[PDB]
């Protein structure tokens, strides 16, 4: 099934300013998008803002601004942040958008016509900050912003309150068996695996029905009205989850503005999402509620949900650190340092160790050696002579790398993809040290041709596979190597030997990554 590769980030609450969590989630989305573009596929990458609900309106109230003005301002800060971070996101969605509201109303009506929405009651605990319903087993005692005694969430530590309201209810309990069949039939649908096991255990225990509306006064009228009942508003999470459906149905112009909402999602070939990137804090919403809504509506389910170790909802300003250390270097560090965990060192010391050790010493040094005037005297890609067994061992690593890295990118597991590329870079470095091509200029010119060609080609292939991670630096590297534009993307260029001998190197000026103290 040839379709548009559809990758999403969460849509972020606009109660507060952009921070590292939001930047991190969207970075992962961006990298996955970029890898699939390098591979030659059509890609639609989506990010955005979640603008309705009690928590947004109360934040606007604290600042003494209208919710309309507040959300527009904070949305602008997110947009500016993602422009500065140099992502390649295809559309930035806002839940205040009138086309999004239309889609929410269509979906609501469909669910109602199916008999899956009924009028009932929610009597229980609720976290306003997480916009989440909680059972009594998910609460404990704690303190609020002042220090007085109250109940808090076990998940997040935020304050919980008791709600008693007549509400529209989604019959989530009826979808337990179908959800379990989906999990078992598609064992790669939630990543990483231990988070998949958590979701399955939760659904095995039983599912209550889910309140999908609230009384309008409780949301300070800052929400989408229920179709046919203006006393009620749509639950911010059904509103929010639906952004993925809306985004899949928007025609977007060259400047990034939506120009049209299509009726049928199949027209644009995006839905369902190939990858939903999320933080671990919103797993239940994406792995239980969302597929239940889609099953109810008769819509296709997403292929993968990837849940990272960080939270979504001692300063670490990403734009400040990127100005200090470099944008590509920061992106590299964030993706290299952690897999699916919080355990990981984000200090200036470790940042410098990885910058110096991996980017400067391993990658950078290797790029300078194979392009240097001392070693590469003709300033071109030489034609290789016969290969030794040691040459063939390195060639085999380079040939195997695209297959290996591709599998890791598709999990997706970006940390392992990076590690696999750097294992090959270390092997190329060891080979260059062994062969000592600086001595071979005088002693054995024929042998240097072979050594230099293999080095150039190893640097090209590794750089291609790192281009989703280091998009700006990869362009500089390809320019130094003199790699034509046509050879900078497409699965055809993952093969060893794609750049012919005779190709002239690009002109010299000059540091790729400068080391720090």
Instruction: Rule CB under 6 A: choose which of 5, 6, 7, 10 binds ligand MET.
Output: 10
**48 belongs to the binding site for ligand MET (CB under 6 A):** no
Contact in structure between 210 and 170 (CB atoms under 8 Å): yes
| Token pair for 407 | 């599998």
Should residue 294 be labelled a site residue for ligand MET when binding is judged by CB under 6 A? Answer: no
In angstroms, the CA 112 to CA 108 distance is 6
d(CA 36, CA 212): 36
Q: Which residues contact 13 (CB under 8 A, 6 or more apart)?
A: 49, 50, 53, 55, 56, 313
Burial (CB count within 10 angstroms: exposed 0-12, middle 13-18, buried 19+), residue 509:
exposed
**CB of 223 closer than 8 Å to CB of 215:** no
Q: Which is nearer to ligand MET, 236 or 329 (CB)?
A: 236
Q: Is 50 a residue that touches ligand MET (CB under 6 A)?
A: yes
Nearer to ligand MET, 95 or 338 (CB): 95
Strand-pairing partners, residue 232, are 215
* Residue 11 touching ligand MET (CB under 6 A): yes
- Residue 97 within binding range of ligand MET, rule CB under 6 A: no
Judged by CB, which is closer to ligand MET: 15, or 493? Answer: 15
| Segment lying near ligand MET (by CB under 6 A), choices 9-17, 266-274, 355-363, 501-509 | 9-17
Contact flag: residue 310 with ligand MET (CB under 6 A): no
List, in sequence order, every residue forming a beta bridge with 134; answer none if it has no partner: 125
* Site size toward ligand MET, by CB under 6 A: 11
Give the N- to C-terminal CA distance of the chain in Å, as an integer: 51
Nearer to ligand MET, 282 or 459 (CB): 282
CA 212 to CA 119: how far, in whole Å?
A: 10
Minimum CB separation of residue 515 from ligand MET in Å reads 38
| Pair type for strands 210-211 and 160-170 | antiparallel
**Residue 391 is a binding residue for ligand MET (CB under 6 A):** no
**29 or 338: whose CB is closer to ligand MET?**
29
Only one of the segments 28-36, 237-245, 400-408, 413-421 lies at the binding site for ligand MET (rule: CB under 6 A); that segment is: 237-245
Tell me how far apart the 2 most distant CA atoms of the chain are, in Å.
88
The verdict on 240 binding ligand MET (CB under 6 A) reads yes
Q: For residue 18, state whether it binds ligand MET (rule: CB under 6 A).
A: no
Q: Does residue 223 sit in helix, strand or coil? A: coil
Helix (H) or strand (E) holding 211: strand 210-211
| By the rule CB under 6 A, 92 interacts with ligand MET | no
Specify the pairing of strand 139-143 against strand 43-50. unpaired
Which region among 120-128, 132-140, 238-246, 338-346 touches ligand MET (by CB under 6 A)? 238-246
Among the listed ranges 4-12, 377-385, 448-456, 500-508, the one in contact with ligand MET (CB under 6 A) is 4-12
336 binds ligand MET (CB under 6 A): no
Q: Does residue 47 touch ligand MET according to CB under 6 A?
A: no
> 435 to 454, contacts with ligand MET by CB under 6 A?
none
Q: Quick check: 210 binds ligand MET (CB under 6 A)? A: no
**Least distance between ligand MET and beta carbon 69 (Å):** 20
- Are 108 and 146 contacting, i.e. CB atoms less than 8 angstroms apart? no
Q: How many Å is the Cα radius of gyration of the chain?
A: 26
* Options 96, 97, 312, 371; binder of ligand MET; rule CB under 6 A: 312
Residue 78 interacts with ligand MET (CB under 6 A): yes or no: no
CA distance 407 to 191: 14
Tell me how far, at minimum, the Cβ of 313 lies from ligand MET, in Å: 5
Nearer to ligand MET, 56 or 483 (CB): 56
CA distance 210 to 167: 9
Closest CA to 271 of 6, 1, 42, 45: 6
CB-based burial, 136-171: b 16+ in 10 Å, e otherwise = eeebeeeeeeeeeeebbbeebebbbeebeeebbbbb
Residue 241 interacts with ligand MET (CB under 6 A): yes or no: yes
Residues 313-332 that bind ligand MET (CB under 6 A): 313
CB nearer to ligand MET: give 53 or 412.
53
**Nearer to ligand MET by C-beta: 240 or 425?**
240
Q: Which of 5, 6, 12, 310 binds ligand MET (CB under 6 A)?
A: 12
- Exposed/middle/buried for 287, CB within 10 Å: 0-12, 13-18, 19+? buried
3-class secondary-structure state, position 118: strand
Residue span 248-287 as binding mask against ligand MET, x where in contact by CB under 6 A, dash where not: ----------------------------------x-----
Q: Decide whether 239 or 413 has the Cβ nearer to ligand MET.
A: 239
Q: Determine if 297 is a binding residue for ligand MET (CB under 6 A).
A: no
Q: Please report the beta strands in 443-500, taking only residues with DSSP state E, as ranges in sequence order.
A: none
Binding site for ligand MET (CB under 6 A): 10-13, 50, 240-241, 243, 282, 312-313
């Amino acid at each position: 099934v040839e379709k548009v590769f559809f990758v999403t980030s969460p849509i972020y609450y606009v109660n507060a300013a952009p921070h590292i969590g939001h930047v991190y989630s969207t970075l992962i989305t961006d990298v996955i998008g970029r890898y699939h573009r390098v591979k030659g596929e059509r890609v639609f990458a989506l990010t955005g803002t979640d603008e309705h609900g009690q928590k947004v309106a109360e934040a606007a109230k604290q600042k003494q601004v209208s919710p309309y003005d507040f959300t527009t301002a904070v949305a602008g800060e997110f947009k500016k942040c993602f422009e500065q971070m140099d992502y390649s996101i295809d559309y930035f969605i806002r839940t205040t958008n009138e086309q999004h509201k239309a889609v929410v109303k269509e979906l609501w009506t469909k669910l109602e016509q199916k008999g899956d929405i009924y009028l009932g009651r929610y009597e229980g605990w609720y976290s306003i900050s997480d916009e989440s319903f909680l059972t009594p087993q998910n609460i404990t005692d704690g303190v609020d912003k002042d220090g007085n005694p109250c109940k808090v969430s076990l998940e997040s530590g935020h304050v919980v309150t008791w709600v008693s309201e007549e509400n529209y209810m989604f019959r989530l309990s009826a979808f337990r068996e179908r959800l379990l069949e989906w999990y078992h039939a598609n064992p790669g649908c939630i990543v990483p695996e231990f988070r998949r096991r958590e979701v399955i255990r939760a659904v095995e225990k039983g599912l209550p029905d889910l309140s999908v509306s609230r009384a309008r006064a409780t949301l300070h009228n800052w929400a989408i009205p229920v179709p046919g009942n203006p006393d009620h508003c749509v639950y911010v999470w059904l509103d929010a989850l639906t952004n993925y459906l809306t985004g899949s149905r928007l025609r977007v112009d060259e400047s990034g503005k939506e120009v049209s909402l299509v009726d049928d999602f199949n027209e644009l070939e995006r839905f369902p999402a190939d990858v939903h990137v999320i933080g671990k804090d919103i797993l239940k919403f994406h792995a239980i509620y969302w597929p239940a809504f889609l099953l109810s509506a008769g819509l296709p389910l997403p292929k993968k949900i990837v849940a990272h170790g960080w939270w979504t909802k001692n300063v670490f300003d990403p734009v400040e650190k990127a100005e200090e250390f470099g944008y590509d270097a920061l992106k590299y560090f964030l993706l290299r340092e952690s897999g699916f965990s919080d355990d990981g060192d984000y200090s200036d010391k470790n940042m410098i160790a990885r910058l110096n050790g991996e980017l400067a010493d391993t990658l950078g040094n290797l790029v300078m050696r194979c392009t240097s005037a001392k070693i590469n005297v003709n300033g071109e890609w030489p034609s290789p002579a016969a290969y030794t067994e040691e040459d063939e061992s390195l060639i085999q690593l380079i040939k195997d790398l695209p297959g290996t890295a591709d599998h890791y990118y598709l999990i997706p597991d970006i940390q392992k993809a990076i590690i696999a590329v750097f294992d090959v870079l270390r092997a190329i470095n060891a080979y260059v040290t062994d062969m000592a091509p600086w001595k071979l200029v005088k002693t054995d010119p024929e042998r240097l041709r072979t050594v230099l060609y293999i080095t150039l080609e190893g640097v090209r292939v590794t750089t291609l596979l790192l281009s989703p991670i280091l998009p700006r630096k990869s362009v500089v590297i390809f320019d130094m190597l003199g790699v034509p534009e046509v050879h900078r993307k497409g699965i055809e260029n993952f093969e060893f030997g794609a750049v012919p001998p005779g190709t002239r190197l690009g002109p010299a000026v000059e540091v790729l990554f400068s080391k720090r103290s």
